[PDB]
């Protein structure tokens, strides 16, 4: 009961899923054939949260897979745990977008929406009770970011009363991947912010920062990035699947991290994260948990969290540990950085506990905090967006499929409307 379904978009959305079920599969004890081989009874009591029931006793993830080209889609199935997805669920086109957001928002993405929305509706309806959707895509792809959001807006117009979790990746300035990134990344923020409830941001630049600074391995591959991101996702729903002292559903985390409907941005991070060297050099004690939780280098988001001031945050411990230290240890952090906390919001940390910890360690914690420092990511991207527009460079693509320049201007103000409006509360005083 109180379950949600999953929807992904694009190669980055496709690839990220490949491990999320891989990471989820080991903890839930699902073998790659879909048969149960678990060792604990509770490993099946709440199994309905992410698996349905069918003939033969084998379970299948209730995911929706959707793409505009066949290379990525066919690729996933052959990977580990890649056979879990059902065949009927897949729906794909035959055109190809190629980072042209306008291509992915009006013509190619919209045309095929009929099935993708249809495959969405069937899955949700059959449940006993829907809880919401979790969305993971990337704003760096016109087909993805464009057709990624277009599905997003329609979902809201069909179901207003359900929460909607959002995951994605945005391009950092120093590390660049596409010269046409700013246009599609920033536009999608316009539609998302008008509909997205919970935050969606995670920065790759800090993703690799954690890759070498903490993990200290020599040459990471795309395997590492998928591993760290998925585990964090498992943290969001950790207590929603197993018993705990004070469970923390999405809404409860939703209920305690959104000061206002529009300021819906969070930065996520995972701890503890140590390399083979300190696996048994370090001691897993509560002082380590907090100490590595609020520091920047563990924060996977590019925004520096020490150049702003927190408005509120909450934590989700995993594993069994006496609560007391959970109470005061969070209390100490809330003062010893006295200035680091905005003044008008008293008692701005939310806490919870989970008893069954993710495999690989006896205890873990996930960070979810809405830090006004996020403005840096927009401003750095915001600066780029305006620059590429004045010279009328690359305006030919998007204007060739029914999109006018009036819309671009509006998005320009709104985002700057957000940044201008976001900074006001940071210095707010009572």
């Amino acid at each position: 009961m109180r379950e949600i379904v999953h929807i992904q978009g694009g190669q980055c959305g496709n690839q990220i899923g490949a491990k999320f079920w891989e990471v989820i599969s080991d903890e839930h004890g699902i073998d790659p054939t879909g048969t149960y081989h678990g060792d604990s009874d509770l490993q099946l009591e709440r199994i309905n949260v992410y698996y349905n029931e069918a003939t033969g006793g084998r379970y299948v993830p209730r995911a929706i897979l959707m793409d505009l080209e066949p290379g990525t889609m066919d690729s996933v199935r052959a990977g580990p745990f890649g056979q879990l997805f059902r065949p009927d669920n897949f729906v794909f086109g035959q055109t190809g977008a190629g980072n042209n957001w306008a291509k992915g928002h009006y013509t190619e993405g919209a045309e095929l929406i009929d099935s993708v929305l249809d495959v969405v509706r069937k899955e949700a309806e059959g449940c006993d009770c829907l809880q919401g959707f979790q969305i993971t895509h990337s704003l760096g792809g016109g087909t993805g970011s464009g057709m990624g959001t277009l599905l997003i807006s329609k979902v809201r117009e069909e179901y207003p009363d359900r929460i909607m979790e959002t995951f994605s990746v945005v391009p950092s300035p120093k590390v660049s991947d596409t010269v046409v990134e700013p246009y599609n990344a920033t536009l999608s923020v316009h539609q998302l912010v008008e509909n997205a409830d919970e935050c969606m941001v995670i920065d790759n630049e800090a993703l690799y920062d954690i890759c070498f600074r903490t993990l200290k391995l020599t040459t990471p591959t795309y395997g590492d990035l998928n591993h760290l991101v998925s585990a964090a996702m498992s943290g969001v729903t950790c207590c929603l699947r197993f018993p705990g002292q004070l469970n923390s559903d999405l809404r409860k985390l939703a209920v305690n991290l959104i000061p206002f409907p529009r300021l819906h941005f969070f930065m996520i991070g995972f701890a503890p994260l140590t390399s083979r060297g300190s696996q048994q050099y370090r001691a897993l004690t509560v002082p380590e948990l907090t100490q590595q939780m609020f520091d920047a280098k563990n924060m996977m988001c590019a925004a520096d969290p020490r150049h702003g001031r927190y408005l509120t945050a909450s934590a989700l411990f995993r594993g069994r540990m006496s609560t007391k230290e959970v109470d005061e240890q969070m209390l100490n952090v809330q003062n010893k950085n006295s200035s680091y906390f905005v003044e008008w919001i008293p008692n701005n940390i939310k806490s919870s506990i989970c008893d069954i910890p993710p495999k690989g360690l006896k205890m873990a914690v996930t960070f979810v905090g809405n830090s006004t420092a996020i403005q840096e990511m927009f401003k750095r991207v915001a600066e780029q967006f305006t620059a590429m527009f004045r010279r009328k460079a690359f305006l030919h693509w998007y204007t060739g499929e029914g999109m006018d320049e009036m819309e671009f201007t509006e998005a320009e103000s709104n985002m700057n409307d957000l940044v201008s409006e976001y900074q006001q509360y940071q210095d707010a005083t009572a």
Partner: protein, 95 residues
């Protein structure tokens, strides 16, 4: 042979007192736990121990615990009863 755990207000350190958690007991019971090895040790997990979680495996049962305490008590003073004779005890040179 020591004394198989200490009194409440004793300064110092007790083997696995900050490395394997051990949250939940008053203190006298915790103290005895450390010396006679009974706890996982190491950042690892035996499948059985995962899944004791609180409500499902503790604060429940009934009389099974009662036989546990009686067995536990007998082995604290009984090792401590290893002293007799009308000569008091080695206060002169033990300090």
């Amino acid at each position: 042979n020591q004394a198989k755990s200490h009194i409440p207000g004793y300064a110092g350190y007790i083997p696995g007192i900050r490395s394997e958690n051990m949250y939940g007991k008053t203190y006298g019971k915790i103290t005895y736990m450390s010396v006679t090895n009974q706890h996982h040790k190491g950042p690892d997990l035996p499948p059985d121990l995962r899944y004791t979680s609180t409500v499902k495996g503790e604060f429940t049962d009934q009389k099974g615990v009662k036989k546990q305490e009686l067995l536990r008590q007998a082995v604290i003073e009984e090792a401590k009863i290893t002293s007799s004779g009308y000569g008091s005890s080695p206060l002169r040179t033990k300090y």
